Amino acid sequence: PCIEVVPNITYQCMDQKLSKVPDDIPSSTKNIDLSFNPLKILKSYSFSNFSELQWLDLSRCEIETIEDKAWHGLHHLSNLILTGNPIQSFSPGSFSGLTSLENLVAVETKLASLESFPIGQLITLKKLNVAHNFIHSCKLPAYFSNLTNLVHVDLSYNYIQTITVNDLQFLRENPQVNLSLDMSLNPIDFIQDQAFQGIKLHELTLRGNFNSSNIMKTCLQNLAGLHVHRLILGEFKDERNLEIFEPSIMEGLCDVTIDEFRLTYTNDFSDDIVKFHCLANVSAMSLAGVSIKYLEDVPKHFKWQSLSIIRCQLKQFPTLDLPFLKSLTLTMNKGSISFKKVALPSLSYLDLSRNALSFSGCCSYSDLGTNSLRHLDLSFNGAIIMSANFMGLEELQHLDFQHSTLKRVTEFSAFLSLEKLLYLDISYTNTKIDFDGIFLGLTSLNTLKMAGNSFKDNTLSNVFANTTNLTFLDLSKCQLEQISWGVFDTLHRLQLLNMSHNNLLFLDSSHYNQLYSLSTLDCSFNRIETSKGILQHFPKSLAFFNLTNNSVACICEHQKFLQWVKEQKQFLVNVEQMTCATPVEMNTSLVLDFNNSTC
Amino acid sequence: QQWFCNSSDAIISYSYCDHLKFPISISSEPCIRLRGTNGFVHVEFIPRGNLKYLYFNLFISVNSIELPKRKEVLCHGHDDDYSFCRALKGETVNTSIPFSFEGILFPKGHYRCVAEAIAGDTEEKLFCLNFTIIH
Numbered sequence: 001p002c003i004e005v006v007p008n009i010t011y012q013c014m015d016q017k018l019s020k021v022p023d024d025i026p027s028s029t030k031n032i033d034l035s036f037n038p039l040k041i042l043k044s045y046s047f048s049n050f051s052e053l054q055w056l057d058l059s060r061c062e063i064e065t066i067e068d069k070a071w072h073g074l075h076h077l078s079n080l081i082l083t084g085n086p087i088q089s090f091s092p093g094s095f096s097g098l099t100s101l102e103n104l105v106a107v108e109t110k111l112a113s114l115e116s117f118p119i120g121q122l123i124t125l126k127k128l129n130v131a132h133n134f135i136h137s138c139k140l141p142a143y144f145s146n147l148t149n150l151v152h153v154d155l156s157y158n159y160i161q162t163i164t165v166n167d168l169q170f171l172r173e174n175p176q177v178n179l180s181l182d183m184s185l186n187p188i189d190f191i192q193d194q195a196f197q198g199i200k201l202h203e204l205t206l207r208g209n210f211n212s213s214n215i216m217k218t219c220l221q222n223l224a225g226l227h228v229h230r231l232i233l234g235e236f237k238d239e240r241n242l243e244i245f246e247p248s249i250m251e252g253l254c255d256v257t258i259d260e261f262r263l264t265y266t267n268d269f270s271d272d273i274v275k276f277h278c279l280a281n282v283s284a285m286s287l288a289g290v291s292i293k294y295l296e297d298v299p300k301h302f303k304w305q306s307l308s309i310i311r312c313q314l315k316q317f318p319t320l321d322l323p324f325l326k327s328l329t330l331t332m333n334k335g336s337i338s339f340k341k342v343a344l345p346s347l348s349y350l351d352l353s354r355n356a357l358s359f360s361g362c363c364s365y366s367d368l369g370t371n372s373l374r375h376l377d378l379s380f381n382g383a384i385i386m387s388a389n390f391m392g393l394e395e396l397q398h399l400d401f402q403h404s405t406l407k408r409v410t411e412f413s414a415f416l417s418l419e420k421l422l423y424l425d426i427s428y429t430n431t432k433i434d435f436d437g438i439f440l441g442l443t444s445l446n447t448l449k450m451a452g453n454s455f456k457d458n459t460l461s462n463v464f465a466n467t468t469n470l471t472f473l474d475l476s477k478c479q480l481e482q483i484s485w486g487v488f489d490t491l492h493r494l495q496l497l498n499m500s501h502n503n504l505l506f507l508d509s510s511h512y513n514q515l516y517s518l519s520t521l522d523c524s525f526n527r528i529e530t531s532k533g534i535l536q537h538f539p540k541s542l543a544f545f546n547l548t549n550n551s552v553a554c555i556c557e558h559q560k561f562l563q564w565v566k567e568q569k570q571f572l573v574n575v576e577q578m579t580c581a582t583p584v585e586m587n588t589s590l591v592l593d594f595n596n597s598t599c
Numbered sequence: 600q601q602w603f604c605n606s607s608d609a610i611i612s613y614s615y616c617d618h619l620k621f622p623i624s625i626s627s628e629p630c631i632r633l634r635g636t637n638g639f640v641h642v643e644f645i646p647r648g649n650l651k652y653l654y655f656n657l658f659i660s661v662n663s664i665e666l667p668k669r670k671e672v673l674c675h676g677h678d679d680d681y682s683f684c685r686a687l688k689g690e691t692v693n694t695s696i697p698f699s700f701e702g703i704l705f706p707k708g709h710y711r712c713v714a715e716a717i718a719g720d721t722e723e724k725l726f727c728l729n730f731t732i733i734h
């Protein structure tokens with residue numbers, strides 16, 4: 001029949017030329033995909049047996065008639081997908097039996113209106129997708145009051161030309177109702193005066209609605225008297241575009257009370273429309289995929305608490321100083337800017353990842369103009385040159401330099417003044433440890449990810465002596481060959497240690513003594529012949545030991561260690577699949593060593 | 600079978616791969632010129648999976664010499680630029696996207712490019728396209 005993706009749980013019968021639902025699919029299955037099949041009529045008592053089915057995909061199944069009592073057995077169903085079936089007309093009782101549904105998707109079902117749509121007894125429903133249909137009425141149905149849990153309604157790619165005081169006269173009598181709404185791709189031309197007067201919405205999406213800035217300006221004005229936690233605006237790179245987007249249009253948004261204003265790709269953008277005075281007293285400013293190239297015309301009275309800059313087109317680092325700005329994100333940037341000094345008093349979250357960005361002279365108060373900094377993300381960038389030592393930024397507790405070329409860190413003692421840093425990641429920053437005090441100063445550190453770098457002479461030095469409070473430590477993929485003596489000797493609190501994908505040939509049990517707190521020791525994929533050195537010395541807190549895919553010498557010289565494998569069977573992961581490395585061995589399962597030949 | 604157009608400086612043909620023969624009537628207007636073109640690639644199909652999180656695997660091969668695997672992100676999942684990203688499994692997609700090829704100074708006789716649309720979410724093949732660009 002189908003494809004068993006998860007036995008007795010999930011099946012894939014997509015595009016199988018099936019004409020009815022299969023008959024020998026378990027009753028335990030929770031997820032069934034029947035998209036792209038000539039089902040034509042969804043017969044009555046079809047899914048009778050499937051009492052645990054929670055998600056049913058019937059996308060494009062040529063369904064023309066939902067027969068009476070079709071959903072009988074499916075009282076536990078929660079996701080019902082009906083995209084692209086020509087079931088134009090839904091007779092009442094269409095959705096009877098679906099007593100547990102939170103998600104109905106009737107996209108491209110040729111749905112004409114929401115008033116006819118028989119969902120009023122779907123009390124469990126949360127999301128309703130009715131995009132890509134023939135809905136002409138922006139009316140929010142009266143049965144919505146029953147739909148006590150339904151909080152998202154998308155009507156994209158429909159024909160809606162008019163929002164009228166009546167359409168929304170339901171959000172009126174129900175201020176207590178938290179509703180998100182999206183009507184992108186509707187050819188709206190007329191919004192009735194005082195329409196949105198008195199209504200609250202969580203989020204509202206208006207993308208590719210406006211043929212002319214004039215139609216827009218005028219319409220945008222009547223949004224007056226509306227509270228929106230989040231209003232997203234802009235257009236698509238492949239749809240009804242604007243000829244000119246003039247900062248003036250936003251006039252009228254000076255009535256609508258806004259918390260978060262999100263801008264997306266515009267056909268014509270001015271680096272100034274973002275400066276506009278109707279954006280003065282916003283708490284959250286978001287730009288995503290914007291043709292913005294420069295940003296510095298930001299007045300000091302703008303009450304911004306956050307700023308988000310994503311997939312944008314900045315040619316030089318912004319230069320700002322908004323007093324109340326707590327969080328700043330600048331990520332995924334078209335070109336390759338370079339850091340530029342900026343003073344933000346209230347800054348406590350700085351997010352600067354995934355820009356071909358270079359930063360030289362990092363870091364201290366002067367760099368940013370605050371002490372309150374807790375988060376700082378500088379990962380997936382370019383050349384980060386280490387100059388100063390985080391002097392003045394003590395409150396910082398999250399440092400991330402992943403895959404970014406750090407410079408001059410082995411040189412000085414870079415992190416020297418970070419007595420509160422809890423999370424440091426220097427993974428794949430392509431580093432070679434020379435200096436012993438690299439991590440000197442990080443006495444509050446807990447998590448140290450630092451994988452895929454390397455060490456002098458491929459020997460594990462003593463960079464961890466002061467990193468007392470460590471619980472997660474990751475030296476995976478670090479071309480290691482040997483570990484030096486008192487390396488792990490202060491970590492009386494470490495829980496997890498990853499030394500996977502190295503070149504260790506053995507393990508000295510003595511190393512891991514003093515690790516009174518250790519639970520997972522991953523030493524998978526290495527050139528590990530054996531362990532040596534009082535096997536009783538391994539911490540009695542260690543529960544998961546991983547020596548998979550190694551090269552264990554089943555020689556008599558390691559009689560003791562080979563016994564240890566037995567005494568501590570249950571604690572090694574996949575012991576039963578471990579195979580010897582040495583003489584004639586292959587079919588020779590490690591846990592089978594005896595005790596005779598020469599010994 | 601195949602589908603092509605002739606530029607004043609290049610001829611571009613394409614046909615479905617050798618295993619994934621899922622439909623798409625892709626096109627362009629005007630026909631791309633190896634050395635600079637402003638135009639519109641026209642798309643018209645019905646996707647087997649959700650398009651939010653779409654990306655492409657571009658395996659190029661110049662003069663019968665394979666280049667390095669190049670991954671091209673179309674939809675990130677959060678406020679995509681193109682209208683189609685929001686498109687669902689089974690939905691009809693009929694749209695035309697604007698592009699801007701800059702142009703190869705001195706482009707050589709033989710080009711090859713195979714594309715796999717991948718659903719980022721569920722890592723599943725969505726369609727495969729095999730292109731040929733001749734000078």
Ligand SMILES: *[C@@H]1O[C@H](CO)[C@@H](O[C@@H]2O[C@H](CO)[C@@H](O[C@@H]3O[C@H](CO)[C@@H](O)[C@H](O)[C@@H]3O)[C@H](O)[C@H]2NC(C)=O)[C@H](O)[C@H]1NC(C)=O
Binds near residue numbers: 151178179180202203
């Ligand atoms: C009214 O209902 C809305 C919609 O359910 C509520 O807003 C929702 O808040 C949660 C966070 O508490 C959002 O969760 C999100 O999860 C994703 C994971 O994919 C994450 O990436 C996001 O950053 C976020 O944490 C949820 O998406 C969000 N919904 C929307 C559409 O904004 C809201 O809590 C309710 N309103 C009030 C004022 O209580």
Ligand SMILES: *[C@@H]1O[C@H](CO)[C@@H](O[C@@H]2O[C@H](CO)[C@@H](O[C@@H]3O[C@H](CO)[C@@H](O)[C@H](O)[C@@H]3O)[C@H](O)[C@H]2NC(C)=O)[C@H](O)[C@H]1NC(C)=O
Binds near residue numbers: 451476498499500520
């Ligand atoms: C110790 O560190 C290593 C190295 O980072 C971790 O190895 C990781 O192991 C998991 C599975 O055990 C890998 O996930 C894999 O994903 C690929 C995706 O295609 C898939 O082919 C595999 O079936 C698998 O699910 C993961 O990629 C691998 N890390 C790398 C980058 O090689 C290990 O988990 C660490 N142990 C810990 C955290 O204690």
Ligand SMILES: *[C@@H]1O[C@H](CO)[C@@H](O[C@@H]2O[C@H](CO)[C@@H](O)[C@H](O)[C@H]2NC(C)=O)[C@H](O)[C@H]1NC(C)=O
Binds near residue numbers: 522548
């Ligand atoms: C060695 O075994 C451990 C545990 O059996 C594996 O690590 C687990 O896998 C995931 C993926 O990183 C972690 O979220 C869990 O925390 C780990 N489990 C526990 C209990 O520690 C590890 O993947 C194995 N080594 C490899 C690379 O296969």
Ligand SMILES: *[C@@H]1O[C@H](CO)[C@@H](O)[C@H](O)[C@H]1NC(C)=O
Binds near residue numbers: 007008026028
């Ligand atoms: C699958 O589920 C059925 C129903 O309980 C069970 O009887 C059967 O043994 C399962 N099949 C196997 C062996 O995975």
Ligand SMILES: *[C@@H]1O[C@H](CO)[C@@H](O)[C@H](O)[C@H]1NC(C)=O
Binds near residue numbers: 440441466
């Ligand atoms: C070594 O660790 C101790 C832990 O209390 C810390 O106070 C000190 O700053 C570190 N280095 C030295 C010796 O200055």
Ligand SMILES: *[C@@H]1O[C@H](CO)[C@@H](O)[C@H](O)[C@H]1NC(C)=O
Binds near residue numbers: 603604605
């Ligand atoms: C190629 O160019 C000729 C020029 O006469 C044009 O008429 C023809 O339509 C082109 N071929 C295609 C794409 O059909």
Ligand SMILES: *[C@H]1O[C@H](CO)[C@@H](O)[C@H](O)[C@H]1NC(C)=O
Binds near residue numbers: 025026049
């Ligand atoms: C449901 O499937 C079972 C086999 O698992 C079978 O006994 C029964 O006839 C089926 N019922 C219907 C009518 O779908």
Ligand SMILES: *[C@H]1O[C@H](CO)[C@@H](O)[C@H](O)[C@H]1NC(C)=O
Binds near residue numbers: 119120121
């Ligand atoms: C919603 O449910 C209540 C109680 O069953 C009922 O009074 C009301 O008429 C229902 N609305 C409809 C008909 O969908």
Ligand SMILES: *[C@H]1O[C@H](CO)[C@@H](O)[C@H](O)[C@H]1NC(C)=O
Binds near residue numbers: 212240
């Ligand atoms: C908006 O432009 C479309 C063409 O894309 C046209 O059909 C429509 O009539 C225009 N609206 C007006 C009246 O300006």
Ligand SMILES: *[C@H]1O[C@H](CO)[C@@H](O)[C@H](O)[C@H]1NC(C)=O
Binds near residue numbers: 254280281301303
């Ligand atoms: C912010 O703008 C509003 C207009 O809504 C104005 O009333 C208020 O004076 C401004 N607040 C500041 C920055 O003092």
Ligand SMILES: *[C@H]1O[C@H](CO)[C@@H](O)[C@H](O)[C@H]1NC(C)=O
Binds near residue numbers: 614713
């Ligand atoms: C296209 O590439 C395929 C690999 O999918 C290869 O088998 C075939 O020879 C190529 N066909 C064309 C268009 O020349």
Ligand SMILES: *[C@H]1O[C@H](CO)[C@@H](O)[C@H](O)[C@H]1NC(C)=O
Binds near residue numbers: 643693
């Ligand atoms: C786009 O495709 C549809 C079929 O889905 C077709 O009817 C329509 O005319 C096409 N749009 C154009 C280019 O006119």
